Amino acid sequence: MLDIKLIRENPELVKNDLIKRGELEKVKWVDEILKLDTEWRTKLKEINRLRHERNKIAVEIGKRRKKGEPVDELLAKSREIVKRIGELENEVEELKKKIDYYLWRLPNITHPSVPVGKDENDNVPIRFWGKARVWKGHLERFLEQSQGKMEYEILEWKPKLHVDLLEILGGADFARAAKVSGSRFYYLLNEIVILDLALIRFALDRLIEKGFTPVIPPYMVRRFVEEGSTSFEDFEDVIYKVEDEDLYLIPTAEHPLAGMHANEILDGKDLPLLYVGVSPCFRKEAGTAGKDTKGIFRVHQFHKVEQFVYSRPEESWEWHEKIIRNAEELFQELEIPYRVVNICTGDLGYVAAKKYDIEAWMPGQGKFREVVSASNCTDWQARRLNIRFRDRTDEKPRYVHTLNSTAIATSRAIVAILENHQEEDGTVRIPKVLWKYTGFKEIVPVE
Amino acid sequence: MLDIKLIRENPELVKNDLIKRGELEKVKWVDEILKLDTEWRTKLKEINRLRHERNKIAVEIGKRRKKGEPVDELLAKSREIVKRIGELENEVEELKKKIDYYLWRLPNITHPSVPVGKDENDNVPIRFWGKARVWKGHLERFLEQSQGKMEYEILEWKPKLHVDLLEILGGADFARAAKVSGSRFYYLLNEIVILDLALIRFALDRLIEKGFTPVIPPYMVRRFVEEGSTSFEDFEDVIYKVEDEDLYLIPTAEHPLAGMHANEILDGKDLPLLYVGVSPCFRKEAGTAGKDTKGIFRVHQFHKVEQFVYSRPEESWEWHEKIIRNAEELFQELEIPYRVVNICTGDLGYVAAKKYDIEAWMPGQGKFREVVSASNCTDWQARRLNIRFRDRTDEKPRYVHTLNSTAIATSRAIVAILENHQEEDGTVRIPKVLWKYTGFKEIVPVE
Numbered sequence: 001m002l003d004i005k006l007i008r009e010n011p012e013l014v015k016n017d018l019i020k021r022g023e024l025e026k027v028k029w030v031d032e033i034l035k036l037d038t039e040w041r042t043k044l045k046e047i048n049r050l051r052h053e054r055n056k057i058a059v060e061i062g063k064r065r066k067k068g069e070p071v072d073e074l075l076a077k078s079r080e081i082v083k084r085i086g087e088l089e090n091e092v093e094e095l096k097k098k099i100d101y102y103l104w105r106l107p108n109i110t111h112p113s114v115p116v117g118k119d120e121n122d123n124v125p126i127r128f129w130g131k132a133r134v135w136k137g138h139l140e141r142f143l144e145q146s147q148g149k150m151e152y153e154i155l156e157w158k159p160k161l162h163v164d165l166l167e168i169l170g171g172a173d174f175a176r177a178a179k180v181s182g183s184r185f186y187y188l189l190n191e192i193v194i195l196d197l198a199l200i201r202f203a204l205d206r207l208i209e210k211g212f213t214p215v216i217p218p219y220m221v222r223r224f225v226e227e228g229s230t231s232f233e234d235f236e237d238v239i240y241k242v243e244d245e246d247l248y249l250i251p252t253a254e255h256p257l258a259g260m261h262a263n264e265i266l267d268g269k270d271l272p273l274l275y276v277g278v279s280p281c282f283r284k285e286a287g288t289a290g291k292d293t294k295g296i297f298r299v300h301q302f303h304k305v306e307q308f309v310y311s312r313p314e315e316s317w318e319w320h321e322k323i324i325r326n327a328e329e330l331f332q333e334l335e336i337p338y339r340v341v342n343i344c345t346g347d348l349g350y351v352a353a354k355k356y357d358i359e360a361w362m363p364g365q366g367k368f369r370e371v372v373s374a375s376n377c378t379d380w381q382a383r384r385l386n387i388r389f390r391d392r393t394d395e396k397p398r399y400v401h402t403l404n405s406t407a408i409a410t411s412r413a414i415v416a417i418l419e420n421h422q423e424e425d426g427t428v429r430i431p432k433v434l435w436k437y438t439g440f441k442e443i444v445p446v447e
Numbered sequence: 448m449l450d451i452k453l454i455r456e457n458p459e460l461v462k463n464d465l466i467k468r469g470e471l472e473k474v475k476w477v478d479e480i481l482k483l484d485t486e487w488r489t490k491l492k493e494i495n496r497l498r499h500e501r502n503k504i505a506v507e508i509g510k511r512r513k514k515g516e517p518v519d520e521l522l523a524k525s526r527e528i529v530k531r532i533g534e535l536e537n538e539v540e541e542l543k544k545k546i547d548y549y550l551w552r553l554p555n556i557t558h559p560s561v562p563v564g565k566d567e568n569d570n571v572p573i574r575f576w577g578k579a580r581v582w583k584g585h586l587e588r589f590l591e592q593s594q595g596k597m598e599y600e601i602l603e604w605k606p607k608l609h610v611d612l613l614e615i616l617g618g619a620d621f622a623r624a625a626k627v628s629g630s631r632f633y634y635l636l637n638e639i640v641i642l643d644l645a646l647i648r649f650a651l652d653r654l655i656e657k658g659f660t661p662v663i664p665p666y667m668v669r670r671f672v673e674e675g676s677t678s679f680e681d682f683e684d685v686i687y688k689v690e691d692e693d694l695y696l697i698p699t700a701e702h703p704l705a706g707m708h709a710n711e712i713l714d715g716k717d718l719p720l721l722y723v724g725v726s727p728c729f730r731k732e733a734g735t736a737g738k739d740t741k742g743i744f745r746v747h748q749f750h751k752v753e754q755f756v757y758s759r760p761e762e763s764w765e766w767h768e769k770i771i772r773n774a775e776e777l778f779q780e781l782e783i784p785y786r787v788v789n790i791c792t793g794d795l796g797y798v799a800a801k802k803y804d805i806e807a808w809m810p811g812q813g814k815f816r817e818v819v820s821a822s823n824c825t826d827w828q829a830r831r832l833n834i835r836f837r838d839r840t841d842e843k844p845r846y847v848h849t850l851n852s853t854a855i856a857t858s859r860a861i862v863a864i865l866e867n868h869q870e871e872d873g874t875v876r877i878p879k880v881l882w883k884y885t886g887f888k889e890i891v892p893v894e
């Protein structure tokens with residue numbers, strides 16, 4: 001939700017951002033909310049004018065009670081003021097309603113640092129890490145995507161896709177999942193199940209060492225926490241609703257983590273509130289149904305360890321910068337080469353002001369693929385969920401800033417590990433850092 | 448689902464089991480489906496009679512093509528025949544639907560060893576284990592439910608309820624969960640989060656050592672798998688359905704685990720199939736809303752590690768006995784005193800032929816509470832999901848038997864650990880076997 005103040009004190013700023021975002025069909029809204037806001041304040045001034053008249057007509061009726069007192073008329077004028085006052089009041093409500101409708105449907109204003117672009121092809125790489133294992137046949141793509149700024153080793157044999165590796169490793173059963181639930185669902189098996197849990201504990205442990213309170217949130221939440229966390233389009237594209245209830249399956253622990261303090265005035269001495277949640281995630285992935293990667297890259301359910309932050313507006317950008325580094329550390333320990341990107345205006349999304357993604361190099365796919373997202377949400381969620389804070393019981397509570405970032409979404413971490421640590425025969429070596437969690441050091445093909 | 452051959456050859460057997468179960472209402476169905484199945488079988492006979500007649504009547508109508516051919520009378524019967532075959536066919540389909548309606552709503556035949564009883568009270572304790580810590584004010588109920596066959600020790604201080612311990616330890620937030628999702632939902636925090644995951648890993652490692660294949664199933668399944676795993680009653684009372692979708696939230700890994708091999712003829716050589724699934728579980732818990740325990744004992748969402756077994760009918764009873772002991776073993780290492788009960792016909796449920804429950808002694812509650820349940824479903828689920836096996840590609844495939852049993856449902860294992868291992872000052876010592884998983888040796892109060 002946008003602050004009405006901001007559109008009043010700089011409509012051109014919001015219109016131009018809408019254009020940098022590709023939300024042109026919504027530029028015409030800035031003026032609409034303005035003329036509505038204007039009408040809103042005009043009627044209110046009218047109401048006070050009337051409240052004042054009510055007072056005058058009052059002292060006047062009584063002033064006659066001592067005199068001739070032909071009041072009758074004054075009493076009828078009095079009757080019209082209340083009649084009128086009520087109307088204006090109800091007219092002012094409807095007006096606030098139309099104004100907020102737009103306010104809730106406008107994306108967060110982007111930060112000056114986010115590059116301008118049309119889509120994912122305009123995202124800007126800003127950092128690279130690791131030594132990529134590239135197939136001779138992906139060399140140009142790799143080089144263009146890495147901008148020659150990343151170390152790499154050329155591979156003789158052709159590296160396999162994660163889906164095929166799950167098969168040779170006996171780690172999944174897709175066909176029986178399709179029979180039981182439909183496409184893009186799966187049964188995960190054997191060592192891959194241990195690997196999934198291991199990834200959760202590892203992520204969990206590290207964020208805990210950095211001071212994050214671990215949490216297992218509700219997996220089903222009430223509609224308001226969903227509309228308080230993202231744009232309404234998500235109800236059609238990503239979010240599942242459960243029949244006959246005000247319950248929605250969460251698409252990320254982020255949402256229940258943000259609703260956690262809905263309608264609170266936090267005590268500033270506590271900020272920043274640091275949460276690291278674990279939870280399964282459910283998404284419709286409606287926009288797609290059969291794009292390309294056929295295993296566990298883009299499915300209906302996956303596990304994710306999530307970082308969530310409540311900070312002072314003056315501390316958020318610094319936090320943003322820390323959470324993305326927190327995710328970067330995990331993948332470095334997991335020995336996964338990657339590049340982090342600054343997402344452009346057109347591929348940014350409604351909630352964030354600025355967003356960084358970690359796209360891991362996927363030897364088999366021959367490309368960098370999103371594996372984590374870190375967003376600084378400014379006060380966009382706070383203004384919706386009414387999450388404020390006060391430093392002195394004195395007064396004036398202000399909205400907090402919220403941030404979120406993937407620590408590890410196991411689904412894609414597993415693909416990154418299978419594709420990046422595979423050997424010619426299919427054997428997949430597991431990063432030393434996880435040995436304490438898994439037991440085994442590698443996963444060998446079955447026969 | 449019950450086998451119709453079974454109700455045709457031994458109707459007394461099934462109505463007697465229905466009366467044992469105290470299902471006087473549906474004892475009537477046996478006669479009903481018998482009469483419906485008779486009509487069905489007969490009309491079916493009629494169909495072939497007429498069909499063969501139609502041919503023999505069309506061969507003699509042409510034999511008249513070479514003769515006088517006063518076939519007008521014949522041409523008329525040939526038309527009466529098809530019109531007859533047509534209505535019979537529809538009568539048949541209608542008949543099949545009515546009998547199936549019943550066949551699918553009929554409980555499994557109980558094993559003679561299942562005690563007759565009306566509700567939980569008539570469940571029979573057959574084994575006890577451990578040394579209970581009993582508050583003096585609970586002495587009577589403890590001896591009542593322990594039969595005085597269990598070692599114990601009287602506490603002069605009143606041990607607390609898990610809900611209060613969760614508060615003092617700082618391991619949960621219920622108020623905020625109610626805000627965001629509704630009642631009987633929660634946020635788990637700090638060490639409780641780690642303990643939860645540690646219990647899942649502990650249960651998995653143990654079942655894996657015993658040769659169970661670890662699996663993470665789909666958490667949402669199509670209606671047919673649910674209808675294949677329980678009684679239809681469960682759609683109203685327990686299972687959440689997702690809007691505009693043939694998807695249902697699973698109440699236990701047992702369901703997708705059973706759905707996994709729906710419509711297959713397994714190779715007997717592969718029997719038994721041993722699976723240990725992990726997954727969150729969702730239940731409506733409609734018959735309640737406010738009963739008694741108000742923490743994480745009866746909630747809408749919990750984690751459970753499930754044991755599932757596909758076996759030859761000749762091995763199912765020995766496996767029933769092995770999986771309950773698998774669960775007992777976990778609870779003994781967890782140092783939780785308990786008793787196990789053979790469930791009476793009244794509290795049995797529709798899919799089990801026999802069931803054992805492990806009831807953990809709960810110091811704070813002052814009573815034994817169900818913590819795990821284990822069943823032998825015989826061929827009830829197998830007949831519904833069409834799961835058969837065959838040793839030689841030559842033989843008629845026959846139905847397998849299925850079994851399921853809790854390994855550890857983390858919610859109740861956690862209340863058991865909190866209540867049995869609390870000290871007077873509020874700290875809880877976590878059992879040794881879990882140290883390798885939790886890291887910490889106990890959980891001390893916060894202030």
Ligand SMILES: Nc1ncnc2c1ncn2[C@@H]1O[C@H](COS(=O)(=O)NC(=O)[C@@H](N)CO)[C@@H](O)[C@H]1O
Binds near residue numbers: 252296370404412
């Ligand atoms: N449909 C999906 N299937 C598998 N993994 C997914 C899916 N959607 C997202 N993910 C994983 O989860 C990560 C985070 O999801 S995200 O929508 O980009 N961002 C969020 O959810 C934020 N709350 C930050 O985690 C993705 O980068 C990816 O690693």
Ligand SMILES: Nc1ncnc2c1ncn2[C@@H]1O[C@H](COS(=O)(=O)NC(=O)[C@@H](N)CO)[C@@H](O)[C@H]1O
Binds near residue numbers: 700851853858
């Ligand atoms: N609503 C609930 N809230 C919390 N824990 C629950 C709930 N329902 C069941 N459990 C836990 O899960 C266990 C198994 O549930 S059960 O219905 O008895 N049996 C099953 O689900 C079988 N698949 C065996 O696990 C219970 O013993 C209890 O420990």
